[PDB]
Amino acid sequence: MKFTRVCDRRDVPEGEALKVESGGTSVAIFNVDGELFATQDRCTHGDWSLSDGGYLEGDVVECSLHMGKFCVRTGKVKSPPPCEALKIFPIRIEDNDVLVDFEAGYLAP
Amino acid sequence: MKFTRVCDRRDVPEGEALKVESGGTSVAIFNVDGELFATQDRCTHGDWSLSDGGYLEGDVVECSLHMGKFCVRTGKVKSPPPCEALKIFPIRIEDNDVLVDFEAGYLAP
Numbered sequence: 001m002k003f004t005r006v007c008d009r010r011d012v013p014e015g016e017a018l019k020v021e022s023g024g025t026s027v028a029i030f031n032v033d034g035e036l037f038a039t040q041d042r043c044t045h046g047d048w049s050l051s052d053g054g055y056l057e058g059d060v061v062e063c064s065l066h067m068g069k070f071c072v073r074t075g076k077v078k079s080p081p082p083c084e085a086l087k088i089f090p091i092r093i094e095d096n097d098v099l100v101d102f103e104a105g106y107l108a109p
Numbered sequence: 110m111k112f113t114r115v116c117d118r119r120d121v122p123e124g125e126a127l128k129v130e131s132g133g134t135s136v137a138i139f140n141v142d143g144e145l146f147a148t149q150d151r152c153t154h155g156d157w158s159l160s161d162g163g164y165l166e167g168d169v170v171e172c173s174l175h176m177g178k179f180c181v182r183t184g185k186v187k188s189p190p191p192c193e194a195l196k197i198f199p200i201r202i203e204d205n206d207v208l209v210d211f212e213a214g215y216l217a218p
């Protein structure tokens with residue numbers, strides 16, 4: 001229902017992440033093999049940025065504070081310490097523009 | 110709504126309760142004669158868990174701290190001290206999977 005233009009698709013190279021924020025909501029955008037995926041930026045186990053850490057392997061991001069891991073496509077936990085999945089956010093690409101609905105974060109089924 | 114799997118229905122036997130949570134949102138799931146009902150986990154009168162510190166008799170849960178009571182089907186108060194109804198949450202059963210939408214808590218009319 002409410003998409004916000006956050007960056008150019010070329011701002012998130014394959015295998016990298018980018019933090020974007022709006023209204024006090026922080027979202028991490030990951031580029032996995034040419035497609036973009038959005039999740040809450042903070043690890044669910046602490047106030048620690050998943051994008052600012054720099055550890056993405058394929059579609060699994062690793063929190064650099066305690067090594068927890070999450071699937072960026074679904075937000076699901078792949079390794080503890082975390083026990084809670086990340087919220088994921090609607091993300092669309094229109095031309096070279098990447099848009100995110102910061103008010104629609106949700107947990108994957 | 111965006112439903113997420115929170116437990117197996119067999120994890121909440123008849124007459125029992127189970128707490129599930131995501132971020133700061135805690136939900137109590139109660140089994141009343143085979144059907145599951147979801148409410149906020151905390152008593153509205155204090156930081157006290159209705160699933161961990163509640164006694165379920167039929168469809169009425171009693172807060173063990175001051176003996177306030179709520180109907181788990183509607184969240185409405187059945188006995189003081191509480192004066193505010195519990196928020197209730199949408200819950201679905203798909204085979205043996207139990208799903209809730211943590212962002213959709215509401216007050217019964």
Ligand code: FES
Binds near residue numbers: 044047065067
């Ligand atoms: S804060 Fe991320 S694993 Fe602990």
Ligand code: FES
Binds near residue numbers: 174191
């Ligand atoms: S905290 Fe539940 S009745 Fe007071």
